[PDB]
Write a protein that binds this ligand. Structure first.
Ligand SMILES: C[S@@+](CC[C@H](N)C(=O)[O-])C[C@H]1O[C@@H](n2cnc3c(N)ncnc32)[C@H](O)[C@@H]1O
Ligand SMILES: [Ca+2]
Ligand SMILES: [Ca+2]
Ligand SMILES: [Ca+2]
Ligand SMILES: [Ca+2]
Lengths: 504, 342, 143, 146
DNA sequence: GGTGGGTGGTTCTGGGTCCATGGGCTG
DNA sequence: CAGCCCATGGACCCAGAACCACCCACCC
DNA sequence: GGTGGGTGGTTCTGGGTCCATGGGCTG
DNA sequence: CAGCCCATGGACCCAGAACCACCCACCC
């Protein structure tokens, strides 16, 4: 911030007043401390005299380096002396091979940024504005590696059907077994009282595919293999997967799916910020259905909500909590539910909003989540726990997400006894904010499609007694999933609450 | 292979003879074939006309791009016309940003290898031998990502003792669990009566430390996550790991060792060949005992062997077998045992 | 025969994995090799992008041009992207004045052979024995 | 002093966690920060690397030189890499021509304060309470006139 | 404006001990 | 036989030692 | 030597349909 | 009550168009 820039200018004069020194060994200490304090904010750190190699090979020594958590450099700094001209020595140092990707050539009087061999900002120092601009741009430069994680995300967004074909073939050839065929008919029974009252054997096959597909990506792209060994839902499903994904078969499928997973895991390993890796979490969430089951993508209305809307919808509810009621999001009693959590962007951005002191109490028992599909549920849970690791500190299993049909949770969530009692504690809580993004689906394409939004008996009964009752409209389109979620939200809300939805 | 280049010498003339063309687009098919064919063996492949972007954000298209299994470019080819003076045209397309990593500027009568912004050689196209040498240099270039893997292997040797200290703390926290104490007696007694009659609980703790250290590395930098649930002794020491590798306890140890693993994890992700992983395997095999049990590392004399020593051995063994017993090394029936594997 | 036909498929599968691109620009290299080899093996060649001129005076450019020793043309190859209904792009090419003597209009999935002006045959390029049939016919169509 | 020393620790592990090196040049950034911050509130300032003269020599160069508001040197610090044995790096240093009027000889996990002609007390840097007591004396040492 | 001392990394390279521990006497 | 006598080669470190990189104080 | 023209790839940007399905009512 | 009328707004996608890179014939 510009505050830090002013602090540096006060240290620059202090060095030439207390020590009276004009040597590079002493006029640069000020900038060393400045970049160091800005860096600790971004997530990098400045490490001095890192001997690096040049284009010729000659060991060079940029006075500093913006090292990451995987010890990769996001940038460099070369402080010279106040007296020597910078533009001449910039071109003499560069000749020996000095870096040019993101180097801040400084001289205790003028700071230039040559980014990509290109002077972008020659801000003369001693500035109450654009010097802060310079450091912002430097600490927010895009590493050449992030633009490849972006390229690999798009390829996978388009070689997903070819990869899914492999997983599809596997599940068909497993139906030749009597251990698969026996356990996939018990999955169906437990899931004909929990999530889908019309759970088909082909819905159980879909869940199996998602579980395996995301398992390989969670242990490599995101490094978290222990998620599947802890998550109640995963365990109930490996019972069904380690019936065919075992020894030889397991190895065969994994080695056949490598010519697709490879590149993504070779660019997702060179980035080390989860917020950048969240772009793939979103991509997988949507693309999977469009490349496998678009019928599910229709009624569930799987879609991602741009962060700008979410962040607005969070700060606005905080600025309404003290207006009509009297509280602040980080208070005690602001129980924030979020039906329809999808990729989890409504609780990940809340973690980032909450301060780093009361966050513990809020993360533990005030943030709640609700999901119906498997891929979104898994993605959301992992995302929330990884955002907690990036914000607070030690990974702590989020124990408030559930797999229940929100509109039907009024023996719901019986897939795992854990999620059943997790949704029972959720039901018992005095919820106060109901934020979220409901599905806006209403009617099918053509009647040869055969895809009606599940009639929610309990919920549509109050719609008929409230919204539909007053509406004398000859046609009745108040049974939209968005209006059904609104009915559920108004009835969960007891008193003093702020329903915040974004819809048609 | 001068063999594969021998055919290039003819296909170049043949393509100008069986059809009187001299333009680059018509005569470049010969060099395409030569490059793509040599690559098939080396492990790479040549993907033609790759629209790789460059500095300043302009988009460029080399005639060919030698890519690997991780879609990571390892070398670029670019062909101009014979009339166009290669030397002058080289800098013309270097300004558009055409990579300077490993580009082969090739006219019909002359080729120029340019490694790290430096002309290595300028072989004439007539000699099959010179051309083969140039192409071998182009195929045996260590991309930036293997000098970075190599730097990290050195750091892992220095980070070994501190990573092992965290694993010792993990095994001591386990030694406080009664579930682990019981599981220990079963393993100590079993490994004693099955490997060497003087096994100790500390040897079992050391063996567990090896199991969990190799375990996390095998599930990421080696990505053979299944190995630990298919190998007999891996499942025999899986109970000794699970005892303290559960929920919060596992998380703590994994996150503590992550600061050491991260370096070699990323490095072995941008690598694909097993030969690079072999260097890290050798380092782990040695450094561990040097920084934990040097007493064991004298009774097991843990040291790795020179590759040239076993390469020459394998040559000699076949020639000797085929001069006294008249059998090939690959003749079904010759059983080969390796007592001290390492 | 069938060996070279299978080799073409292998090459194309490596292009869509080592590069990931399914664009013809990179995929054509596989069929270029197959056509060039069966040719040398049956006394011929596959000189590439040789500009032909049409009756209307259009400098057309087929992706291939099977030519023989006295420098005359015997066949022409034209590969289209694997991302278009082939029987549509065939018309567009021929409407520029593309040769109709013996032309292989080929997309990554289907290979259509035209001779004089009629579709002689269309094969799934995946079936080894079937392509082997169509390719042999193209290399044996004598004036 | 106690909260400040308890943050010099954090930025020590940070040099190795982010950079991945234990060479003296990079690990000296933590102690530099600590000393400068402590001196600021007290009034003084650690001006790093002020070439100081010698009895026998052309010139020497300490890596820390507490210089008061009136440009007068009243204390110093010479860092050490973990490789060297600190004790033998001390005699090597105080022989070339290094000052002894007030100098902190710190390695990375142990620190002595050779003050005005003799060592005071040797403290380990892992212990916050210990390093606190010693740095206080580096800062509460005043010449005899004062 | 050079230009060497002076601090620090860095990578070679030349060169070299006391003493375990079985067996054969052996009283 | 036990308790003395007699052999007889040994799965590496490391202290300089150049030597360079950066850079400040002194001759030019 | 430029240059327009063939071949192919890569971004933008503009621009818009019949028909599902619950209520309300004759009958 | 049960057929029989009467609404009423509906979570994208794909063809051109501009334009760009690369090389070839053809004016120069
Ligand atoms: C728009 S997405 C969630 C949006 C989320 N903010 C995001 O950015 O991904 C809608 C999600 O609601 C979930 N969902 C949960 N309960 C549901 C219910 N009762 N009916 C429909 N969808 C439900 C679906 O599984 C689906 O993934
Ligand atoms: Ca400098
Ligand atoms: Ca070319
Ligand atoms: Ca074509
Ligand atoms: Ca020092």
């Amino acid at each position: 911030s510009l505050q830090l820039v002013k602090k540096f200018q006060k240290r620059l004069e202090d060095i030439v007043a207390y020590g009276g020194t004009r040597n590079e060994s002493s006029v640069r200490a000020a900038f060393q401390q400045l970049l160091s304090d800005w860096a600790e904010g971004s997530g990098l750190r400045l490490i001095t005299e890192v001997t690096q190699k040049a284009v010729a090979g000659n060991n060079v020594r940029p006075d500093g380096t913006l090292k990451d958590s995987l010890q990769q450099s996001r940038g460099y700094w070369e402080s010279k002396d106040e007296a020597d001209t910078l533009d001449d020595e910039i071109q003499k140092k560069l000749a020996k091979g000095y870096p040019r990707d993101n180097i801040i050539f400084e001289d205790s009087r003028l700071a230039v940024l040559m980014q990509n061999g290109e002077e972008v900002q020659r801000v003369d120092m001693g500035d109450a504005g654009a010097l802060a601009g310079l450091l912002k741009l430097f600490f927010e430069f895009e590493p050449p590696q992030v633009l490849e994680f972006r390229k690999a995300v798009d390829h996978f967004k388009d070689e997903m059907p070819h990869l899914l074909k492999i997983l599809r073939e596997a599940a068909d050839a497993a139906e030749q077994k009597a251990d698969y065929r026996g356990e996939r008919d018990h999955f169906v029974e437990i899931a004909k009282e929990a999530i889908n009252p019309d759970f088909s054997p082909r819905d159980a096959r879909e869940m199996l595919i998602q579980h395996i597909l995301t398992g390989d990506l969670f242990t490599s792209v995101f490094d978290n293999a222990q998620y599947h060994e802890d998550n109640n839902i995963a365990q109930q499903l490996q019972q069904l997967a380690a019936t065919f994904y075992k020894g030889p078969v397991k190895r065969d499928i994994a080695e056949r799916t490598k010519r697709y997973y490879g590149a993504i895991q070779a660019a997702a390993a060179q980035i080390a910020d989860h917020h950048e890796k969240q772009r793939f979490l979103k991509a997988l969430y949507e693309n999977f259905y469009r490349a496998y089951n678009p019928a599910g993508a229709e009624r569930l209305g799987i879609f991602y909500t741009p962060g700008e809307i979410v962040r607005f919808m969070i700060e606005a509810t905080d600025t309404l909590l003290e207006k009509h009621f009297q509280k602040e999001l980080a208070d005690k009693g602001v129980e924030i539910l979020d039906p329809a959590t999808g990729t989890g962007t409504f609780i990940t951005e809340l973690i980032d909003f909450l301060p780093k002191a009361k966050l513990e109490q809020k993360y533990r028992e005030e943030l709640h989540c609700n999901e119906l599909a498997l891929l979104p549920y898994y993605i959301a849970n992992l995302n929330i726990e990884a955002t907690y690791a990036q914000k607070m500190g030690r990974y702590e299993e989020f124990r408030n997400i559930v797999l229940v049909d929100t509109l039907d949770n009024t023996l719901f969530g019986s897939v795992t006894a854990e999620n059943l009692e997790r949704a029972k504690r959720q039901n018992a809580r005095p919820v106060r904010v109901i934020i979220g993004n409901p599905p806006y689906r209403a009617n099918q394409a053509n009647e040869n499609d055969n895809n009606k939004n599940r009639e929610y008996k309990e919920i549509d009964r109050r719609i008929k007694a409230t919204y539909v009752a007053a509406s004398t409209a000859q046609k009745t389109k108040l049974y939209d999933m968005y209006s059904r979620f609104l009915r559920w939200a108004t009835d969960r809300l007891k008193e003093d609450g702020i329903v915040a939805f974004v819809s048609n």
